[model samples]
Target: MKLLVVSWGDFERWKETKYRFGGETSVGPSTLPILQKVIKPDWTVIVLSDTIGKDFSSVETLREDVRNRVMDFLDRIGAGREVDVIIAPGIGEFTHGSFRGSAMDAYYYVLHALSEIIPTKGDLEVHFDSTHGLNYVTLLTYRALKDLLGIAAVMNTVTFYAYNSDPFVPKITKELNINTIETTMVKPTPLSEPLPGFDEYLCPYSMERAEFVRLKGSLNTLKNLRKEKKKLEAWIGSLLFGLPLLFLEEFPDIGRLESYIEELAETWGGAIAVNAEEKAVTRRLAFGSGFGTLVKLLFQARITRGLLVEEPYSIEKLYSVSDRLFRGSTLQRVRVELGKIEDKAIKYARKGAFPRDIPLRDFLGFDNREVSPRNVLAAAGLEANVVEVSMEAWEPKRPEEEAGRHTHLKYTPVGLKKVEDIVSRALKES
Candidate 1:
């Protein structure tokens, strides 16, 4: 199934003006007509607030004002289809007038309103337009898709596009053209929506843009890009579900895939530009919430790939890897905050090593557990050779015990890295 979504701006108050969008006449050539031809969706949804024109009378005519223009454009283009118009409650103006809880309710209702029409299953393609309405509408719509639609609906083939009408033409341009508008293959990521101007920098320059920027029209192209995307989904799921072992399985590849994720962030929008130069220089842009604050710091403090993914080591060597991944208390605030996941870590020990997490903790004398012969031997599975390998691994860290060493891996991204690195080192040899 295929679906298209767009917003109905406040057109009732200013019916005399006509503008261009998506490189054509305002609604005539806007994201609707352009995306309609490209996606050939089964349905289109038009969303608006009940008070689209700021007064009670707007309730009757507001939706019609926008739909008439949208429908006429489709008629001209011969792309007629069902238009599901949704009217959500809007906040009343002035202190004396009535209201809908708070001003933000209008935006929040979008989450439920959108669920009514576009909800479907099976292989699907969603084409969404954010250019016609107020900015927060775009954010909430994207938020709606993420929260309401579930992973299956949007994970594979959803596309987000907008019309960048000239700001000068009529306060907002009416000159939207079909040829100039571009499409983006947006998917679920670690970042949330409400992005600013990333479309201008990240999406294709025109409809043809995805052809080159996305890496391929070939099967190889889709897969390589999919490779990057799949990793992102798994890691995001790991964080969401608090699955440490699942996260660590690919933790070695964590640093490697970080750059690929940043590439997709551009398409999700809200890019920052910064440059430094002389004879030598650098220009850069970045995306994501946890990335700069949490993800990047772990990347900086992470153990070497050689030690974690390639080398074969026992318990003590593993401790060193954990030690380096944490620094002083400042940025380690990330680590401190990570303590939130400690409960899940305990619950999820099958959910680690020494056969599993508890035995490893017991053998290490951590969390107030004794480092007895029983725990040690069990950690080795009484495999004499393996146990010997471990003391050689365990012997050296006679170092002082500290609270950080308990590692609750307490299951933050930092600890998650440790859990992943320990397993990676073990798996390399196994």
Candidate 2:
């Protein structure tokens, strides 16, 4: 997907006002209306700074205001249905305690920013509008974004635009004049940092991360991890992006990945020799969150191979993987030739158990509150009213009882979000 990214900052001037960029002026909030009108990107993300969690209320207010202005422009341009826009309350300048929340809160903010972009990966074309970013914090985020692009997806072409308002800064009283800044082109580079191996360096992090590092140790030698790590990263990137093709192509032997991941849960796990619970923990990670579920489908049946028999996973199928609702469009094509979505998509849903005797609203991911099409789509298995509707894929230990049942299904944070979109549309209209 093509994306346009920008930043918005403090104040009343941001209200529907005049701004010029690229030899064009737009009477909207930020550069988005200006760049968006010219670039016509598929998605646009507007990041706003969060001074502190306490100040987030105002940040959200600005976010909504900017969102409305953007939509107004889109509506006026007759592009209402053409583009998708998002406003993210992002990181602050401070890393010190209580700066914008806490030094620790920074991770949540950064992850939030990333959550928006990573899923759009696997051939990502991003146009960074550095023109309106808030302070150097954004500049730093931009730098890391370059590294993130490589790790999270196949970044095809990235162009960042920044207009120096420095000279114009002195003349705002006289009149505001915007000048063009060169658009720099850069190739994405993966993080050159080494994967943590020995626990001395690894223990500070979570078990999942430590396990991933250990798995890398197994897949690759300590002397050389760059290549294998990229391959593995791209695989996780695939799963994160929800397109099985990249996952398929990145590592053809997913079964091995499963074994490696599963084995690590058992290995040097505690310095931690292999054990029943260890292997079981590995299975939980694998199958939970649809990773293992995806594995079982791909490795065991090679199901998608048959579904995508046109040689490799086709664009149509990949589209379904990217945005679940698009499944109908792709499924429509697939169906005329086809397996019913109920038989196909439903079969996948059946891979695990779903919440029963619960409110549909709750299952659909609302917690006594919500809206937006995808927002609703994403929540079913989803949650609503604070009470989570547990949607899990599992292995039943006993034929007729829940006694030994293993709750194998895990909440697929990103991959299934795309799938959720598919299921939403498929359920409502199909």
Candidate 3:
């Protein structure tokens, strides 16, 4: 069977700092380490990258170089038997917190931008709408706010760029007509970073970082201060005596410490490990706003284009609707309308038959609370509401920004909000 293996460039880091982590000095080892036996099943893998992360659109100098390499790799992979399936694995998305939400947030940012540049309406929204990435934070957020803010369903999704524009994936899939398997670790994913091994010990700071927290006693301490006594190792042995106590240790912060303990057993260097150069990252609230941001940005560009160049009535109608729905009022409603919008071609307005901006909150008469579509649905006796829906992919103007934002999902996922507390509120359904 034909297979497509994709490496989604490091988007998380780009979103955070617009710079590749592990710095510029370690390019060869850090950026493109030779992939010998990493991927299995004897498939062709395409490593598409230039500046490490999703800086594809903005960095033109880097874009051509990457595009060439990606195309080259595709050509090489298409050489043998019938290619069946395509797999684009995002590198280093460690989900310590909310993995699916975090990843989907990135996906919406990228897909919408790309839709504008390389237009396609093949349900990019569904790319990220999956059941897999669901986790604790999402659950907690759902449970706490489900009643307060009406929601329908909580879903985690994914999409790959291959479905829209990539040549190899579709050609191979069409010829082979085989199924594709996309898998990921079920956890909250952090942005990709450097691999931790004995080699990162180039600097002196790496030596004593093993004992992350300083201890008054010699418990599990890497340093033996007085080598003659070997008290530190003895302390480790003492913990072993009461194995249950060792299990209760809080170092790994999980019930299953066996995995970590097993991995640490491989590291024989009796030294501390430190995240020497690591810095904290602040995830923007914009990420949580999801695909709405992408749509708004595109509308802005569409307006700009209208002002700069002459276009048809369809284009003018698009500008008018976008201006009122996007700029005039009720962005929440505008987001909902955009998602469910069946047609992209604008309807001709005969003089002044403009699309009305429906204040979802006012329509539902839930004036006391913040106006959102989810609440409106609950007030109307519906279980949930689609606050925003759109089949539009990421339609941003810039490339680097596009790359930084692009995520691996086939479509845009809607905010499936649930309904609650309507018995008291006089919310009569229309």
Candidate 4:
């Protein structure tokens, strides 16, 4: 199976100072801890850095930084091996800087990266597709709290186009006449039972009482010009709004603000799961939680996550391998963190626990266990790691089988012999 990817941001000192990460001074911070916590020893890691060139103080600078990071990542992957999954933190801008790269930009970057790796020429199932939020406030004024929890809370009402409709979901069906996710707020009337039921759903431009900016569609054949201008504007806007929030460390409720942003994200970009009253409660917690404090907190958390995803080693595991791939104190910290997680995973597994509601192993595709010596050898490309086990198909114990239809709990490897033997016996007797 291809490797599963998981990334996170690193702490401040590592990114800015280039302090050792994953036991290595040059790998960047956040590399080691993530590996220990989320990655497996058998899998290969591909790190993407957020702070190599310079601090992103302006939109122009931030955009350039993003461009550079992408190129560097591609180059690294090209030099080594293929990557199956990419796990990144803080899709937009890092918490340390003023620039606000939209999640949209982040998604665009991932799409482009995937295009480079996958066969997109004629294969239809998988190909590069350039396919596709709001907020309010005064006490949470747009400018004062744009990146604040208040704005982030606005994520609740949004939904992406890919989830529901797609290749066949024509753009003309949308009120906007474009392919995009529509918030519950923009939902039309008579379209649902709640007449004006979604009066509370708010979009940024809508909340500011600003005109809807033309997002996409043929505009005098000026697509390229429009795209660049808009991106440039967004980069600038983020710089104007996101930077100051980073340094305001003295805010009293910084901790709470940090938690809410993470919580807000859990249900954001989808439907608001709670009732109107619940949403109201969330809004208050988001706004009253202190706008400035939230901004500062977001920057910190984001930058930290970004820095973590860019390294290939971890300090804790420095001695885990014989080659001495890891080499730094910070990575040691990450290693410690990962050790705690593994311990917890084992404890949980013993009690049949799940980190998330979903079974963790399902995503990992195997039970948590030490790398077999055979697999370890294979990982080093020294030998083939092979194993064979007898298995059978599992089928539901139903009343009867349809003429040629097989129906036993579908199929399980444990029962393959029963069916195969029956066929063999019949052929021999005939």
lDDT of 3: 0.24
Q: Candidate 3, residues 161-257: lDDT per residue as tens digits?
A: 1221112232223211112233322221111111122222121222243432332123231222223112212212211121111111111212222
The regions of model 4 sitting more than 4 angstroms off are 2-4, 10-64, 67-79, 83-97, 100-202, 205-210, 213-430
TM-score of each: 0.37, 0.38, 0.21, 0.21
Instruction: Report lDDT (Cα) of residue 270, candidate 3.
Output: 27
Poorly placed runs, candidate 1 (over 4 Å)? 13-35, 53-81, 92-100, 146-150, 153-157, 168-175, 178-183, 189-239, 242-430
Predicted structure with the largest TM-score when compared to the true one: 2
For residues 264-315, write the lDDT of model 1, one tens digit per residue: 4333222211111111111122222322222321221131233343323323
Model 4 worst lDDT run, 10 consecutive residues: 188-197
Question: In model 4, how large is the Cα lDDT of residue 279?
Answer: 15
Q: Is candidate 3 or candidate 4 better by lDDT?
A: 4
lDDT of each: 0.39, 0.39, 0.24, 0.25
The local distance difference test score of model 1 is 0.39
Model 4 scores a C-alpha lDDT of 0.25
Q: Model 4: what TM-score? A: 0.21
